[PDB]
Amino acid sequence: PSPAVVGRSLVNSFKQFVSHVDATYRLVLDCVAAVDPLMRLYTFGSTVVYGVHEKGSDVDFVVLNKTDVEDGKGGDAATQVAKGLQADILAKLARVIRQKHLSWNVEEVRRTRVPVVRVKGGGAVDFDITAYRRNGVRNSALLRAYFEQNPPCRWLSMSIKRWSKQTGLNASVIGGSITSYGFNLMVVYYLLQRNHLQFVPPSTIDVSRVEPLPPHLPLEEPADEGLELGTQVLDFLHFFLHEFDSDKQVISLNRPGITTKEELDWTKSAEDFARMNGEKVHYQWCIEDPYELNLNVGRNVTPLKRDFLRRHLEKARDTALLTI
């Protein structure tokens, strides 16, 4: 197709999306007050990034203490004790949520690097609780900060996210490699390279100044019937197929300009020594975490999943990201 055609099939595909989180936030703070009344609740993830709440999206919360919040720029420990601490306080809160809401499924998730409690209410009321981590709110505010720069870019984002679940690329789907977060990191990196955004050093995001529940950010329709959205997609996909060099480069918001794998020691050699969650890390598709230490966000992109990613980045160019 063409920028225009793509733009219209996309605005068309979102048209019933354009047709209240405080209540959940409140519901949840109930259970935290019960565990410890001095304990803060922070919202993060797409709600906070986009300033809007989508259907098919959950809500991400983290429970923090006063001093975790005042240490607004501290890192998150990746020690075993940190993980012990976080699991101890999320077991109690889970116990409390179950004990206040019998219909709800409260699953204490332990597969992960980051201990999380997963809650389904049935009423498509969904959410994840984590404890004692700042990086979650820090990177969402960092991505929020950027999206406020150029608010219509949220459409490029939402368009990429939805397609990634649909393609089976998103970490939410079996066989998926990159989280929704990882994809936002690409959207932004791309827009940076192309000058639609101004660089914001990650270290200026100060948790002691973020809002626990930030204000809504009106999402408005593309007022050119999609031409800007359409030409950005066609270009985003061109950027990742023909401009970004996955063998020598790292998608990163840590520096403006290029970051190489060489300078990070994200190399073949590294892979042999590397391990994350009692398992291999891959350095095929490299996405540098703004805040975590030496964490590649596409560590699951096996040499084969890098095939599918290229495979899909090409089909998406002729299917308007699966809409026509």
Ligand SMILES: O=c1ccn([C@@H]2O[C@H](COP(=O)(O)OP(=O)(O)OP(=O)(O)O)[C@@H](O)[C@H]2O)c(=O)[nH]1
């Ligand atoms: O590898 C990860 C994944 C997630 N996160 C933290 O979790 C937040 C939400 O993680 P999600 O990947 O669930 O993304 P999302 O909420 O933007 O979109 P949906 O797929 O839910 O519609 C992210 O924005 C980030 O703060 C990480 O820090 N690292």
Ligand SMILES: O=c1ccn([C@@H]2O[C@H](COP(=O)(O)O)[C@@H](O)[C@H]2O)c(=O)[nH]1
């Ligand atoms: O670095 C991370 C990774 C995960 N999570 C939380 O745990 C859930 C599952 O993580 P993942 O399995 O998508 O990596 C996410 O929705 C999010 O709330 C984080 O806060 N930080």
Ligand SMILES: [Mg+2]
């Ligand atoms: Mg989420």
Ligand SMILES: [Mg+2]
């Ligand atoms: Mg998630």
